[PDB]
Amino acid sequence: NLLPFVGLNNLGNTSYLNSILQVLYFCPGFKSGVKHLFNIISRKKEASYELICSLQSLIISVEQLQASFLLNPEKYTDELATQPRRLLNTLRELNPMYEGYLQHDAQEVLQCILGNIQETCQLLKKEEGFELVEKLFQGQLVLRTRCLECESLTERREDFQDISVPVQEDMKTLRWAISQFASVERIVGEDKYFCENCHHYTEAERSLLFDKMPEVITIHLKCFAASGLSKINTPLLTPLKLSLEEWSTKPTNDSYGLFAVVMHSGITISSGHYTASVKVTVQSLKEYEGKWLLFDDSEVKVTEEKDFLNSLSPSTSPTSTPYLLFYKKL
Amino acid sequence: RKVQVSYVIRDEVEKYNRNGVNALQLDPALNRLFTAGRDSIIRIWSVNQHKQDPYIASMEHHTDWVNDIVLCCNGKTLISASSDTTVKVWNAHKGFCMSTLRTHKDYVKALAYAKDKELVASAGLDRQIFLWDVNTLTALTASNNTVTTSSLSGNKDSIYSLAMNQLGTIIVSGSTEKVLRVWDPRTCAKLMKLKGHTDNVKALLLNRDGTQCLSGSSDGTIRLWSLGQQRCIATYRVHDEGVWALQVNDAFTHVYSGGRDRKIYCTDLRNPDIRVLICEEKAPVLKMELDRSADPPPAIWVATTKSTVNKWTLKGIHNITPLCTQPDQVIKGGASIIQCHILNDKRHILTKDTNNNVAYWDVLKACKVEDLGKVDFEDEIKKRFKMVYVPNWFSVDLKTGMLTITLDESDCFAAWVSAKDAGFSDPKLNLGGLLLQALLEYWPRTHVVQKGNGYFQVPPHTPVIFGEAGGRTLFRLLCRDSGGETESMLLNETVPQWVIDITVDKNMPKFNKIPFYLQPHADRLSASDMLQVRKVMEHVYEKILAEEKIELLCQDQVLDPNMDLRTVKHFIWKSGGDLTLHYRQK
Amino acid sequence: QEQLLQSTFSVHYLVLKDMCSSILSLAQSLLHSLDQSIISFGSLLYKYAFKFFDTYCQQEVVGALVTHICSGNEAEVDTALDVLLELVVLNPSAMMMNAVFVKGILDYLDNISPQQIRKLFYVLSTLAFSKQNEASSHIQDDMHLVIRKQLSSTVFKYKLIGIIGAVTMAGIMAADRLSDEQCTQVTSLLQLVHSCSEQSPQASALYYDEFANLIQHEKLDPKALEWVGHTICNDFQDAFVVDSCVVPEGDFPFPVKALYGLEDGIAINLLPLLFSQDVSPLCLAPYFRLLRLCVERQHNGNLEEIDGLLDCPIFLTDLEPGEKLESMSAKERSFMCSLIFLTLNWFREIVNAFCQETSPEMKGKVLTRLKHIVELQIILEK
Amino acid sequence: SMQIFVKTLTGKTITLEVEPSDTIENVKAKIQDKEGIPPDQQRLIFAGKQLEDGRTLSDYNIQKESTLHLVLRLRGG
Numbered sequence A: 001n002l003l004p005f006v007g008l009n010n011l012g013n014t015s016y017l018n019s020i021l022q023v024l025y026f027c028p029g030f031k032s033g034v035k036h037l038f039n040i041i042s043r044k045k046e047a048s049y050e051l052i053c054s055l056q057s058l059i060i061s062v063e064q065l066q067a068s069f070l071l072n073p074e075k076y077t078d079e080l081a082t083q084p085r086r087l088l089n090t091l092r093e094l095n096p097m098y099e100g101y102l103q104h105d106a107q108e109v110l111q112c113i114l115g116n117i118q119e120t121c122q123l124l125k126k127e128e129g130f131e132l133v134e135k136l137f138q139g140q141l142v143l144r145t146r147c148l149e150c151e152s153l154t155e156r157r158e159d160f161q162d163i164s165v166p167v168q169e170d171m172k173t174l175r176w177a178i179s180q181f182a183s184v185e186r187i188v189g190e191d192k193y194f195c196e197n198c199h200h201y202t203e204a205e206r207s208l209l210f211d212k213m214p215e216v217i218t219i220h221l222k223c224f225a226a227s228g229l230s231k232i233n234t235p236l237l238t239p240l241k242l243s244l245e246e247w248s249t250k251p252t253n254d255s256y257g258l259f260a261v262v263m264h265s266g267i268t269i270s271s272g273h274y275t276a277s278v279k280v281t282v283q284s285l286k287e288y289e290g291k292w293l294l295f296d297d298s299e300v301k302v303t304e305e306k307d308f309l310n311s312l313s314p315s316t317s318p319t320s321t322p323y324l325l326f327y328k329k330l
Numbered sequence B: 001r002k003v004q005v006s007y008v009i010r011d012e013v014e015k016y017n018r019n020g021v022n023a024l025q026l027d028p029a030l031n032r033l034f035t036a037g038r039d040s041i042i043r044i045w046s047v048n049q050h051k052q053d054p055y056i057a058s059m060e061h062h063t064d065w066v067n068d069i070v071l072c073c074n075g076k077t078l079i080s081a082s083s084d085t086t087v088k089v090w091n092a093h094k095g096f097c098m099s100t101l102r103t104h105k106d107y108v109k110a111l112a113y114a115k116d117k118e119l120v121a122s123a124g125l126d127r128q129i130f131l132w133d134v135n136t137l138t139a140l141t142a143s144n145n146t147v148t149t150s151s152l153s154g155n156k157d158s159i160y161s162l163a164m165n166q167l168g169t170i171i172v173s174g175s176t177e178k179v180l181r182v183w184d185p186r187t188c189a190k191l192m193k194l195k196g197h198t199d200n201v202k203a204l205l206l207n208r209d210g211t212q213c214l215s216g217s218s219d220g221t222i223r224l225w226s227l228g229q230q231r232c233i234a235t236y237r238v239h240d241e242g243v244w245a246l247q248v249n250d251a252f253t254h255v256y257s258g259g260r261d262r263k264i265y266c267t268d269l270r271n272p273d274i275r276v277l278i279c280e281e282k283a284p285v286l287k288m289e290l291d292r293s294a295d296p297p298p299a300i301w302v303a304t305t306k307s308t309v310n311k312w313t314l315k316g317i318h319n320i321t322p323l324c325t326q327p328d329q330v331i332k333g334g335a336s337i338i339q340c341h342i343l344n345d346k347r348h349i350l351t352k353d354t355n356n357n358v359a360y361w362d363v364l365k366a367c368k369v370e371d372l373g374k375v376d377f378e379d380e381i382k383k384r385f386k387m388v389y390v391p392n393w394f395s396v397d398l399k400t401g402m403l404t405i406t407l408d409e410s411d412c413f414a415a416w417v418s419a420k421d422a423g424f425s426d427p428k429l430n431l432g433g434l435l436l437q438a439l440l441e442y443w444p445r446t447h448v449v450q451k452g453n454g455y456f457q458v459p460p461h462t463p464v465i466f467g468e469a470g471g472r473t474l475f476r477l478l479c480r481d482s483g484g485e486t487e488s489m490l491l492n493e494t495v496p497q498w499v500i501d502i503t504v505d506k507n508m509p510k511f512n513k514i515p516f517y518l519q520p521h522a523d524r525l526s527a528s529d530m531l532q533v534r535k536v537m538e539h540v541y542e543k544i545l546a547e548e549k550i551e552l553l554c555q556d557q558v559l560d561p562n563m564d565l566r567t568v569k570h571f572i573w574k575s576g577g578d579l580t581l582h583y584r585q586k
Numbered sequence C: 001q002e003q004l005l006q007s008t009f010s011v012h013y014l015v016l017k018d019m020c021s022s023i024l025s026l027a028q029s030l031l032h033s034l035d036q037s038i039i040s041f042g043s044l045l046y047k048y049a050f051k052f053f054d055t056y057c058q059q060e061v062v063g064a065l066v067t068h069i070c071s072g073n074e075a076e077v078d079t080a081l082d083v084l085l086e087l088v089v090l091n092p093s094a095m096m097m098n099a100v101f102v103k104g105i106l107d108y109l110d111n112i113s114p115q116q117i118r119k120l121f122y123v124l125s126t127l128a129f130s131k132q133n134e135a136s137s138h139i140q141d142d143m144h145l146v147i148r149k150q151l152s153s154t155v156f157k158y159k160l161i162g163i164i165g166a167v168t169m170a171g172i173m174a175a176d177r178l179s180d181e182q183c184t185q186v187t188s189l190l191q192l193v194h195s196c197s198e199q200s201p202q203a204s205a206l207y208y209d210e211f212a213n214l215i216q217h218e219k220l221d222p223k224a225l226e227w228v229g230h231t232i233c234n235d236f237q238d239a240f241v242v243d244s245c246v247v248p249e250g251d252f253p254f255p256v257k258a259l260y261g262l263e264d265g266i267a268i269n270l271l272p273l274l275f276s277q278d279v280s281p282l283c284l285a286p287y288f289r290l291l292r293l294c295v296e297r298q299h300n301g302n303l304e305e306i307d308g309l310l311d312c313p314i315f316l317t318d319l320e321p322g323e324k325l326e327s328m329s330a331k332e333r334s335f336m337c338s339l340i341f342l343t344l345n346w347f348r349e350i351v352n353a354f355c356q357e358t359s360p361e362m363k364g365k366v367l368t369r370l371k372h373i374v375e376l377q378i379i380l381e382k
Numbered sequence D: 001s002m003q004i005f006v007k008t009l010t011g012k013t014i015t016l017e018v019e020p021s022d023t024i025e026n027v028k029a030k031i032q033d034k035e036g037i038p039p040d041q042q043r044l045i046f047a048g049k050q051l052e053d054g055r056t057l058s059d060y061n062i063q064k065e066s067t068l069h070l071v072l073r074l075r076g077g
């Protein structure tokens, strides 16, 4: 009954890292990129880099156990999984907060992993494909301010890796959440914009626009509120198909398809459990194409697409709150 | 909230506008024009062509942008709205503020007037619309200072324009809701919700009987509405950019419009094809006033973002190349300070205005030192750089086109400067404490008799303003007026404790202390920020003539003997830890 | 009296509601006392405030109780836990939305005794399964994950806390008043506890002790009893019970024989497992008690299935001192002293099982075992 | 002194008056005055990078009209 998909063992309050690693492993082009960086580093060494090495070791380890299970399925009975002990240890050196066995944010550890990959890429490119994070997860935002007195426009350029959107007002769909993010908003009253053309505090309209789009659109759901901090257990209506044309500087025909969801189970924000649900994109592996795998640490299940989306629906109240949505470019 | 003390560095008489003009009101009986300036001053001008100097009076009681003015009661009363969240009643014949209405919670942007009923409505960014009867407002006295308020409701966003009809039976509101809301001022009941605009509305007009409404919006379209049918009966698109000002004739057949595109057009309402380009202004048009002495109007007064107010003749509209090329009459305007730099001593400021002139100011004495002409502003900053560091103790805002200096409890007393370092001939001096004593010099409560701080004096005409931090103006007065009976009683209630401590109790503020490390170059010490390097030099000398034998180092650089520790920590140190100094024999 | 306090709140809660903060401060001070009359009144002052006041003062009541449970006093923690249980039973709907604060006590289990930990899990479990609404399902799956990450904890104390909490939850989960999907869900929880405690013998012993007390003192669904009895009976047979036909073999430094039989048979393979430790034999007694109770519950007091365990011999050495007590080494006596304790504990548990029989020869076997306990106990002092 | 924007948990933009020399502790304290979220529970994301405590706004090249994003920690394990 064991599926040919390697899970990850919980080393003690590390399902935040396991859910991220399973999403990153199945992310299109991430395994290919990390292999390429390892080749450059290994050749450079044979002629700071530990995180790239640790990622390579984990990817190979997952690959070999998957290979061995296919050849000899009788060798494994209870569960097929491996331990990211080396990768976890590297995170403790890079970030001291990971020392111990406490519970951590899944988006934060993904940010730490992706942030240090780009630093290694920049250092290697400085010493010298190389644009792993930038082509995959990094896009460009255009933030426009319109003073309501003089009607002058000011613009800013800012990069982004994830789109943090609200889930509540203070049913709703993902379209509403991105509207609350990038549609025009009026800042008034206590939050007046200081126009340097008027030399005065004025009301203004702020709108965000997508200029450059990455290969992977990460949506960070603010499933938490303040009054006092609490968790919002009601999800949005997450669609399988997403088009960011409404909020783009140029008209585009490029749509994105959902391929990974990171969920959080718990009634509070200070503790809980993280699980990942990933869509599957040798001959026996093709029977899982178009299906969703749920990664509950070392246990891997499989779910049909129509059943998985119903599990995400707010109508059937789920105990696992979606927290990160990953969309890949079609 | 916390009370802040602020004052304006200016001349006694500001004859000309130092910023743009937001509103215009014309008095046909006395031939007088009123300009609501962005420099917080209302001015009266004689529109008679004979007078080479049209200036009459300045109505200076606001502390921020004056947004709207209405001239009511046959030119005897003026109502004004301002960004300081207050509505004020003025004596338009003498030119003094009679009362202040503090019902609004945000900027007050619009004033509507009904001539027949003497009814005035004030609306603003707090989404409120209040109705006022001028006769009740003008009849207020010291004992009779209570008024019943009738406020319209229903508007879900900030109002930018307001209008009423001649008969006082229809009131229309324009806001960023992109819709027009109409009430009946008599019953305060909602009538209709006009829709069709796709942007903010800044201009509104109504006819005598209040059955048709003209509205101009930031979307660049003028819409004529029918209140009977509750629909838009015509739309006019004659402007490239948003329409900000509207004027109509007594027959309500020709509309005069101007906006951000700087062009003014005369369009016939019966047929939009007949359009006349009156002029092309040098700045975006904020407001226009029609000369209604004759029909058709002979001329129009135009207020823009510049300090100059121009009058354009309208002879030949009914008789693209503009009709006019030069304004018939011109009201002169001043210069607005647009750039500001506080020098390293925290006592002098270099400013650059809209005329590119650069001036040198003394904050402590609250006066201008010298005009530097059209010298490059950045170069003048470099030519006046000094290797000294004084902590920030004031803030500068240029919202009125003038120098306003704000003093806050957090950092007013952070700058201790020796008398020798300043121009006063050495005892230690606190710049913030000295300025506060000079601002409140005429206040009898500060007398124990000597007056002031005994070193300098701000000009007597300096407007001293007390207001809440990010709030409302508690009390405004001139420096020389603190001795009056009314002002002194008001000062006792508004002046906060942190100003009483220094100006009345004569207490001395804290002395900031900077600890530092002395180590031999190859024992933590705490000293005053003003301590010179010589004092540290002689301390090491006694530990082991002192000037000659000992050289102190920081970051492998030599320290000037006359330089102070405060300057060393700021420039040379370039580190986020306790300042370390290294001593070695010469 | 209680009735005066009950009547006071019942008809004049309108005026008392204005001062809920003042009443709760009075209630909290009363609970710090040492007399039961004062403590009982202070607990009542908490319960009546929760019953009659509004939502905001109810959160104050729960927050005040959580502070008492985290205070450290044995008297306060015991009393406040009783108040929490009463509030859950009385008004589960009001306590339903206060579960976040009650869940917060789990962060302070270090200064809470194991007896109070069991009670804290009982109120949490009975509150999570009080209703079937969507609010309960969030807490139900929340409680499962808290224990799931305690069962797998490397820290031994939290591993034991996970066993106590998971056995406690299964009691409410399988409590008889149960559909198949609930029956397999509680069964999966027990399979989780069994797997986690397999390695550690003392942790495995706690699982048997806690789960046996649940079978004895609680009435559960028959289907739940069906699975537990099946898995225990076969595992116990495979673990300890061995055939008497096959002679023992090994590298034992002692002669190994079958001892203490009565009157082709089964026997308890006690000694070789004890020697190999130089299921663990240390869990033989608590495990058999679990087997006996599970068999008894399904058959309603009938126990023919474990008849052979009473009279079966025990694989033991020549336990009589053959004038070699002084020559015995320290390792040998220490091993053999544990041999006597495990043999005595097995016989004591055997007596517990068949002490309620009626048949004459059935009773004589028990008395013979009772005689064996006494005489073998005398050998212990040697 | 400049003005920056912070998009809060509801997506609603607020404004702060900051110095280029202000530390991330100071910025987080300003948000607490406007939002009520304790600084230790605050995560500030600028241009895809989380602002680290102990550094200043000049380290990240944060200038006028720069937008920060405020999120909390959803701890799991």
Ligand SMILES: [Zn+2]
Residues within 6 Å of the ligand: A147, A148, A149, A150, A151, A152, A195, A196, A197, A198, A202
């Ligand atoms: Zn502006």
